């Protein structure tokens, strides 16, 4: 799934140095980077999405159950006049894509936060370079507006999701020569408003500023499209203690980059459950991070985990390996990894995991593991008591696996809390309804707005009527619509087509045809008594 | 020919609320600092607060479009006053005769915005066409914007001192 948010803001009537103006540079880009993520057999799953900066009932151009036809069609007619409502637009961008979450059983809120259950999706936001407008002045700061939030929403406190990519294209294109071709492969950020927006939700914001920077922009952005897994790291708390093969001192602290989850839907157990601890009874439920802050710490811990426990394969995409390669990428070592903020009753983390490269030492395998490994793998009365530090939700999917076993437990302390299952298909419905209410009102326009206001400086009630583009207005039909020059003729020409008694007559003087002339359409619409058997 | 008394008659004017004369002394010692505004005016003898009162002027004058040119003149454009001054539909400026003097892209933006709304289709094609000008591209070196700021603002001044005196 991929929305290209186009902003079409009267700001981008400007024309470059090629003859034409941003918009049609960002339009053919578009049509570019579709040829070439056709060239990719794998584009037979995604759906297109298109995204303006107009009203909300005008925004959406196409959205859910529309083909590539009408998203080319209304990517084609694109009018670039309005201001940049930048803030406004993302936010109707992400609430259209977070419109069928509540209802599938994505993040649930209830039951973990499972990685497996995944809706990837690419902003490209292609705006002007600055100086965004709210009709009032000229701000800075790029704030997003919360007016109307979603039924369901507080839980997240967060507009985006945990696939939800930004990237950028700011079309920095001069007017005159655009010489600046001296790096050949470099491509600098933007560093404009849009830039903290986009590293928060972990894609980069390009600068275009030639055409060739263009075309290498694009030919890099078509390799970053896969699974979302998007999870934040944190040096705390082990004041890099790295002392493996040199000394340390670094950047690769906050790492947000995302992981490739490749199926064999995807296949996986053993979810992040959750960052607080949940009670038995809370009637108002913490909200939720989009992205978890989880932290590493650096500890052999007997890296060596062989059992018969069900094997994942989240692969990690290489974005700050320069840490671990200085380390010789730890060969037969690794690190465990726990969650922050309150993961059990009373402790400041609980390891869950590590990061245990590949033998081919290529990228991260991000190795999950259950809530606490290192006591359920090595009765005498002890998992009855061991069930007790682990949350009571969790219980849940590690169950499954017991089935790979036996079947122990039962459903006697499978409750996660009698509050929180209260007050969740209310929301549910009504996040179906409105999801259900903007997929109807997506491509019905119904402007209807013309009109000149005459005002006063049949009283307090006139309006001058506009320039209508398609009128089409009817000559045989209608006798208004015949002008003063081309009367009589058209008088005799009624008047021979009224008394020539034809078959099939109709109101239209000339009406050759429409934009499109098909071949194969019209020769549908026929009868030919030939099959070429020689 | 003193720029600093005529500066001093054009805001004693000002304050007796005759603004017509306020601009005209205005231009006057606009005129004798720059030789006819062939070159760029002195920062001193033009200040922030004399392209302020020039606005205050301009606006109760029923002359916005003026007024959206001046508020360029300043060392920080003041998009607030203009975009105020644009909302008005009762100029006696020549609206769609002074948009070739706008440089800045956010003005012209705001311009066509305001005629696509008020279905006021011809006048949006000629601030599109005026966007759509190579020398304003909001992406030159600077080399060439603040030529083509300083020839506009030489013409917008030429044009206002042939209106008034």
Known sequence: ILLFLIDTSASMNQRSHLGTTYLDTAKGAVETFMKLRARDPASRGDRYMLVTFEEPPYAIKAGWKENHATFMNELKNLQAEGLTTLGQSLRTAFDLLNLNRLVTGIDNYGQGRNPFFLEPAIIITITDGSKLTTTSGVQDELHLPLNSPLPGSELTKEPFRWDQRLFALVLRLPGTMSVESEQLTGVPLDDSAITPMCEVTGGRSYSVCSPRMLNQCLESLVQKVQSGVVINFEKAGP??????????????????????????????????????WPDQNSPTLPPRTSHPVVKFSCTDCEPMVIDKLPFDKYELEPSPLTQFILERKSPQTCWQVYVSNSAKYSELGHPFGYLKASTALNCVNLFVMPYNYPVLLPWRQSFESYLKTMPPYYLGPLKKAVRMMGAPNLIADSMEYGLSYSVISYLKKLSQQAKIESDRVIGSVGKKVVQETGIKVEYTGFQVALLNKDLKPQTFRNAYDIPRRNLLDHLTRMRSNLLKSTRRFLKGQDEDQVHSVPIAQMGNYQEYLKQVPS | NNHSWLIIQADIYFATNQYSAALHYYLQAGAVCSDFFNKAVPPDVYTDQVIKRMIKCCSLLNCHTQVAILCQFLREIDYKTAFKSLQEQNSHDAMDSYYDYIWDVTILEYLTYLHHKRGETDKRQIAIKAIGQTELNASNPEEVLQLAAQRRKKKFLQAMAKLYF
């Open chain 1, 239 to 276: 004041d890099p203690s790295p002392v493996e093969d040199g000394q340390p001192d670094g950047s690769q602290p906050w790492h947000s980059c995302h992981k490739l989850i490749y199926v064999r839907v995807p296949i996986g157990h053993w979810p992040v459950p959750e960052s607080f």
